[PDB]
Every structure is written in structure tokens, then in C-alpha cells.
């Protein structure tokens, strides 16, 4: 299968990459090295991850070693709730470039609809813990994406966690300039997006699916979850196939179109889930591992449910 995906930008998408939310400090400056090292061309990143200057540490170490070209890597980030803000968006993906030690982004998302009080805090509560608004709306913070295109420093822009009436409020912007190449979206057999899928690919719309092994390290995962890669299910799969849980569930997306980023910081699974290039799931593998859609969901936050854009 092509390692990569045209977009409606008319540039090529590496279909999987690495993640990098909650990778330490310390351990992802490797990962991201040993990852280039077994091929990897494309990181996940973003500036509330915490990371970026660390990713950087080791995308520049290894542009420096001529281990990999810049235009061979698709680097990734997002601009965090509490830039949506006309004066504040550039500074912030100025902030990423630097951090990560670049002059331009492949591609720079929106990434989450909606929008924040700017300050320090990444989550600005009020007294009773709701998140505080910005007036913001999507269109204007599409707008200020567009201008980054124009003044280069990013090659493509999309969006994150936009359901199907806020991508379809991107595509009917007026004056839009530039389409969304990416709506990036978890997916994975519990929470299976057909519905969205559908709507985007129809659009031209590339879809990243994200926590494509249910995020098992989210930070509010309870005992009694959902386990995919437990699942005896998805197991017998893999093992019919001859690899692992892990690389049926990159494999899955990728045959349906999608972009994949699954997230590791131990150097033998980075290898093993790239090790997916070599086998196909039947068309019957498919349908019986979109059957086991539960739509479960694992990123959520209550704090936001009352925003006006919160998408879900
Ligand atoms: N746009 C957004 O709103 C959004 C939201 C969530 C995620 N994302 C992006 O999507 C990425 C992936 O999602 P995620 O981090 O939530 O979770 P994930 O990729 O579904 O799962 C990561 C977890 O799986 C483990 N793992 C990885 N490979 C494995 C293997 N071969 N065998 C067993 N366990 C394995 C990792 O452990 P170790 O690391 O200990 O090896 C880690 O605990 C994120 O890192 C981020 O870049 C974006
Ligand atoms: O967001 C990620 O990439 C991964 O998750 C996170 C990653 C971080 F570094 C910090 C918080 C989150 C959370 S709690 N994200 C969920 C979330 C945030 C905002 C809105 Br609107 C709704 C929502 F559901
Ligand atoms: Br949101």
C-alpha cells in the first residue's frame, strides 16, 4: 500500500506517523530519533503536549545528521484553545516553529473548535469550574489559519475534533480561501466514525484518525475500560494475520483511507507499529472490526461540555 496520501493542498501525507501527547520530556527526544531512524516521516505534535521543544531536539538532530531531508518529514502541531484570537494565532505558531525548530509546518490544525480565554493557563476555569470562553467563532480563527498559509509559514491547515456541522461551517465560510486538508478525529474499533468519515472523505478531507489503540495511557483511564488491545477479539485477528493487536489496529485505518498516528516512547513498539506496510486485512476483517463500534469515546472533557463549540 503508498506510504502516502495526496491532499487537497496538493501535497503528500506520510498515512502514518508518531504521536507524541504524554511522551516524558525525557524519554521523547529518542522516540522521536528512533523513529526517524526505523522510517518514520511524520510526528504528531502540539504545543499544550508540553513536548515541542524536545521533539525538536530531535527532529534538528537528525536533519543535522542528513539522516532524513526537511521536505522528506511531515511535521504536525495544533493551535492550542487560548490563541483564537485574531492578534494571537501567528504568535503561537511562531512559538511551535521555534520550539521545534523549524520554518515552516506541513501542517498546522485547529485543535479543538473551540475557543478560551487567552493567559497562562492552558484551561482557564471560572470559580465554579466551567471553562471561560472566548468570543471567538471558527470562522475567524479560520480566517487567521488562511493568513499562515499566506505568509509561509505552513504549507497546509486543518482542523481537529470538528464534528460534521463544523466542518460543514469551515466549507460554507464566506470567502473562504483555502479548505481544511485534515479534520484529525479519534477513531478506532469502539468509536468507528463512519457518519464523519463519510462526510469529510466526500469533501476532499483528509481524516488522522488519533488514540487508534485507545489511548490505554490517557490520564482518566479507570480499571474496568474498554481494552482494545485486550480485546480477545482483535487479538484472534492478529494473530490470524501473524502480528500483533497493536499492528492490526494501525493497519485498520490505513485501509480505510485514514492518516494514523499511533503514540509510543518504547523504541521496540515505534519499530513493530511501523512494521505495517506488509499485509492486508480482508474485506471481512474490516466490517467485523468496524462491528465492535460501541461509541466509546475516550477524549472528552467535562469541564468544556457547556461551550458553545464543544463538539460532541
Ligand atoms: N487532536 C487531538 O485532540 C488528539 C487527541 C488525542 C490524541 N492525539 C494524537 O494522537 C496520538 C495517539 O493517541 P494517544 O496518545 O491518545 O494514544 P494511542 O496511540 O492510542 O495509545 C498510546 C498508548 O499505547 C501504547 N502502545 C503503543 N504501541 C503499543 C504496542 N505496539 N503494544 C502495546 N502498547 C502500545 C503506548 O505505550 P508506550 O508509549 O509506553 O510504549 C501508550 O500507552 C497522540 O499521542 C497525539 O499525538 C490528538
Ligand atoms: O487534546 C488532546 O490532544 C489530548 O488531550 C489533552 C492533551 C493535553 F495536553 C491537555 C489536555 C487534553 C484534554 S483534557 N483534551 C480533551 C479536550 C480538550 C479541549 C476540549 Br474543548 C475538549 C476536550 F475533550
Ligand atoms: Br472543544
Same mark, same amino acid.
Given at each position: 500500500?503508498?506510504?502516502?496520501?495526496?491532499?487537497?493542498?496538493?501535497?503528500?501525507?506520510?498515512? #502514518?506517523?508518531?504521536?507524541?501527547?504524554?511522551?516524558? @520530556?525525557?524519554?521523547?527526544?529518542?522516540?522521536?530519533?528512533? %523513529?526517524?531512524? $526505523?522510517?518514520?516521516?511524520?510526528?504528531?505534535?502540539?504545543?499544550?503536549?508540553?513536548?515541542?521543544?524536545?521533539?525538536? $531536539?530531535?527532529?534538528?538532530?537528525?536533519?543535522?545528521?542528513?539522516? $532524513? /531531508?526537511?521536505?522528506?518529514?511531515?511535521?504536525?502541531?495544533? #493551535?492550542?484553545?487560548?490563541? !483564537?484570537?485574531?492578534?494571537? +494565532? =501567528?504568535? %503561537?505558531?511562531?512559538?511551535?516553529? *521555534?520550539?521545534?525548530?523549524?520554518?515552516?509546518?506541513? #501542517?498546522?490544525?485547529? !485543535?479543538?473548535?473551540?475557543?478560551?480565554?487567552?493567559?497562562?493557563?492552558?484551561?482557564?476555569?471560572?470559580? *465554579?469550574?466551567?471553562? +471561560?470562553? *472566548?468570543?471567538?467563532?471558527?470562522?475567524?480563527?479560520?480566517?487567521?489559519?488562511?493568513?499562515?498559509?499566506?505568509?509561509?509559514?505552513? =504549507? %497546509?491547515?486543518?482542523?481537529?475534533?470538528?464534528?460534521?456541522?463544523? +466542518?460543514?461551517?469551515?466549507?460554507?465560510?464566506?470567502?473562504? =480561501?483555502?479548505?481544511?486538508?485534515?479534520?484529525?478525529?479519534?477513531?478506532?474499533?469502539? &468509536?468507528?466514525?463512519?457518519?464523519?468519515?463519510?462526510?469529510?472523505?466526500?469533501?476532499?478531507?483528509?481524516?488522522?484518525?488519533?488514540?487508534?489503540?485507545?489511548? @490505554?495511557?490517557?490520564?482518566?483511564?479507570?480499571?474496568?475500560?474498554?481494552?482494545? &488491545?485486550?480485546?480477545?477479539?482483535?487479538? %484472534?485477528?492478529?494473530?490470524?494475520?501473524?502480528?500483533?493487536?497493536?499492528? +492490526? &489496529?494501525?493497519?485498520? @485505518?490505513?485501509?480505510?483511507?485514514?492518516?494514523?498516528?499511533? =503514540?509510543?516512547?518504547?523504541?521496540?513498539?515505534?519499530?513493530?507499529?511501523? /512494521? $505495517?506496510?506488509?499485509?492486508?486485512?480482508?474485506?471481512?476483517?474490516?466490517?467485523? #472490526?468496524? *462491528?465492535?463500534?460501541?461509541?466509546?469515546?475516550?477524549?472528552?472533557?467535562?469541564?468544556?461540555?457547556?461551550?458553545?463549540?464543544?463538539?460532541?
Amino acid at each position: 500500500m503508498a506510504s502516502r496520501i495526496l491532499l487537497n493542498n496538493g501535497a503528500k501525507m506520510p498515512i #502514518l506517523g508518531l504521536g507524541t501527547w504524554k511522551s516524558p @520530556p525525557g524519554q521523547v527526544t529518542e522516540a522521536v530519533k528512533v %523513529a526517524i531512524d $526505523v522510517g518514520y516521516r511524520h510526528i504528531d505534535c502540539a504545543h499544550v503536549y508540553q513536548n515541542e521543544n524536545e521533539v525538536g $531536539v530531535a527532529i534538528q538532530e537528525k536533519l543535522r545528521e542528513q539522516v $532524513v /531531508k526537511r521536505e522528506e518529514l511531515f511535521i504536525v502541531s495544533k #493551535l492550542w484553545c487560548t490563541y !483564537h484570537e485574531k492578534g494571537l +494565532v =501567528k504568535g %503561537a505558531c511562531q512559538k511551535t516553529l *521555534s520550539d521545534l525548530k523549524l520554518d515552516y509546518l506541513d #501542517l498546522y490544525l485547529i !485543535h479543538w473548535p473551540a475557543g478560551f480565554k487567552p493567559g497562562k493557563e492552558f484551561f482557564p476555569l471560572d470559580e *465554579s469550574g466551567n471553562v +471561560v470562553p *472566548s468570543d471567538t467563532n471558527i470562522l475567524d480563527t479560520w480566517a487567521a489559519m488562511e493568513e499562515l498559509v499566506d505568509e509561509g509559514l505552513v =504549507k %497546509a491547515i486543518g482542523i481537529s475534533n470538528f464534528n460534521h456541522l463544523q +466542518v460543514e461551517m469551515i466549507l460554507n465560510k464566506p470567502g473562504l =480561501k483555502y479548505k481544511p486538508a485534515v479534520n484529525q478525529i479519534e477513531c478506532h474499533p469502539y &468509536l468507528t466514525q463512519e457518519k464523519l468519515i463519510q462526510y469529510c472523505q466526500s469533501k476532499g478531507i483528509v481524516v488522522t484518525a488519533y488514540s487508534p489503540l485507545g489511548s @490505554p495511557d490517557r490520564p482518566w483511564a479507570k480499571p474496568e475500560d474498554p481494552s482494545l &488491545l485486550e480485546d480477545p477479539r482483535i487479538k %484472534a485477528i492478529a494473530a490470524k494475520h501473524n502480528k500483533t493487536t497493536a499492528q +492490526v &489496529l494501525i493497519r485498520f @485505518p490505513m485501509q480505510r483511507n485514514l492518516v494514523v498516528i499511533p =503514540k509510543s516512547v518504547t523504541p521496540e513498539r515505534i519499530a513493530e507499529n511501523f /512494521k $505495517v506496510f506488509d499485509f492486508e486485512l480482508s474485506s471481512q476483517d474490516m466490517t467485523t #472490526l468496524l *462491528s465492535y463500534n460501541r461509541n466509546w469515546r475516550v477524549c472528552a472533557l467535562l469541564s468544556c461540555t457547556s461551550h458553545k463549540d464543544y463538539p460532541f
